[model samples]
Target: GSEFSRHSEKIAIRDFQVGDLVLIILDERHDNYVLFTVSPTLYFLHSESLPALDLKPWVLGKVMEKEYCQAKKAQNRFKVPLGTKFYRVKAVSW
Candidate 1:
């Protein structure tokens, strides 16, 4: 939010009411989520953190190492090691 007077030509439009507002993460010292105006703030929000990926192992082990001889099996073998993750949310605010 420091320099906002020059780059103001971007816009987006939607035809329906949304229960969500897409946010931009500004990790530049402010370390907060930046959301645009106007959404249903009355509703409660809940979510889980991002899942850890095994794509590297999956790719090298299945696709690359094996040349994907079994594409369907490789597809099924892609893994996201999910459990309790880093943090929860509070309107996704700081």
Candidate 2:
């Protein structure tokens, strides 16, 4: 298992594993889904047109949403609404 610490409350979630996909909504004003593939030593994130692999800390932001990803193609897009601030979605069981 891995751990992710949130800046909001110093919250540490120790239930994640490597290769688990996570949705990181950077700033919330953006419409793009900053997706990340988790790893033990680093977070492999997709930034811009390329992949931002091997990120330090690998800590997840404030997780504000949770949903079941029914399929691989269905998980490509995010379902969160616009104008929401500081939100994150991590793969827990899917």
Candidate 3:
């Protein structure tokens, strides 16, 4: 089962809390793995930022097995395995 949500432009977001984890793509300026919260937006050490410009919009999601599943299918990267669950937060787009 899956669900979906859509957005046309950027949306408002709240400051991230400590210990909050994110699935941000890798970049030369950030860590390649192990993302953490840093208030307004989650940030990696430096080398984990995804180079895809179109992936700028960060959508908060539930960490599932193999995929970062979300309440909406549109927000998920792909189908995740079963029985995977973790601390998920509200989503935002921009």
Candidate 4:
């Protein structure tokens, strides 16, 4: 189980922990994946990056552009596009 902090609170540098999910902009200096996952550093972040997105615990979701060519019909129709990316977000930090 996890708890969330208000995004408006100013958390001190010593307060962060490993499993904390933070909303951050792409630093561009680190790399793309860091941007996607948000910076996980347990240390200080500059004041400019202080306001973090304390998101709810991650939930699993799936996306499909089209059903498999198999016989079973699905209720949902693909209005997004004809491509599938199978985008997945990690449920917890390892």
Candidate 5:
């Protein structure tokens, strides 16, 4: 079921459903990134790990058994809204 979307260079994304194989391009970065909105997360106090940049070609991530992040969390953490409705997302496989 890996029918992920293809080459949508600089397109506008207005929807990110759960179970979708999202392609995350950072222009600032690349490859894939699991949509947290499609799954969810919180603004936890911690730093991510990534040191061996020269040794790795891409990052490896996974949706650990029902990863969920409410919009309430992001609203407070990222402050993406004074009142944006949370469109809770889901985690998936490759």
Candidate 6:
């Protein structure tokens, strides 16, 4: 069940479902995590990279679970390594 949309440079309205956790890309340089509300309303605070707090990568809430579709999205979205997932996260941690 590790399947999600592909090669969407920008997040589509349907990219998220209710109760699904998602990271919102802010500009080309930064992104943040958010919970998709009942009708696409983002709630709570999206984590951010805090150097002063010893946060690595300097990009907070950008990490994805290790899964097939996530790896694909990582390659297509971040153009980085091959260990990531966004389609279906088993568990979300803050």
Best by TM-score: 5
Candidates 5 and 6: which is better by lDDT?
Answer: 6
Question: Deviation in angstroms for 87 in model 6?
Answer: 3.8
Clashing pairs in 5: 26-29, 37-89, 38-89, 38-90, 39-89, 39-90, 40-69, 41-69
Give the clashing residue pairs of candidate 6, or none.
49-60, 70-84, 70-85
RMSD (Å) per prediction: 17.1, 13.1, 13.3, 15.0, 9.1, 15.3
If both were scored by lDDT, which would come out higher, candidate 4 or candidate 5?
Answer: 5
Q: Which ten residues in a row have the lowest lDDT in candidate 5?
A: 43-52
Tens digit per residue, CA lDDT, model 3, 1-24: 122343322222234343233344
Task: Provide the overall lDDT of each model, using Cα atoms, as 2-decimal numbers.
Answer: 0.21, 0.33, 0.30, 0.26, 0.29, 0.33
Per-residue CA lDDT of model 5 for 1-94, tens digit only, reads 3334433222213343333333332221212222323234321111121121111223222222232244454335334545443332232223
Q: What tens-digit string does per-residue lDDT give for candidate 1 at 1-94? A: 3345323423211211232223322222323222232442211111221111121110001000101021233222212123312211223211
Model 4 Cα RMSD, Å? Answer: 15.0
Clashes of each: 0, 0, 18, 0, 8, 3
Judging by lDDT, tell me the better candidate of 1 and 3. Answer: 3
For model 6, how does the per-residue alpha-carbon lDDT over 1-94 read when each residue is reduced to its tens digit? 2334322233223434333334433323214322333333323222332332243331123223322243444434333346643343222322
Writing each residue's lDDT as its tens digit, candidate 2 over 10-91 gives 3333333343334443323233444443332222122331223323223344333443222234223333334322223332
* TM-score quality measure for candidate 3: 0.20
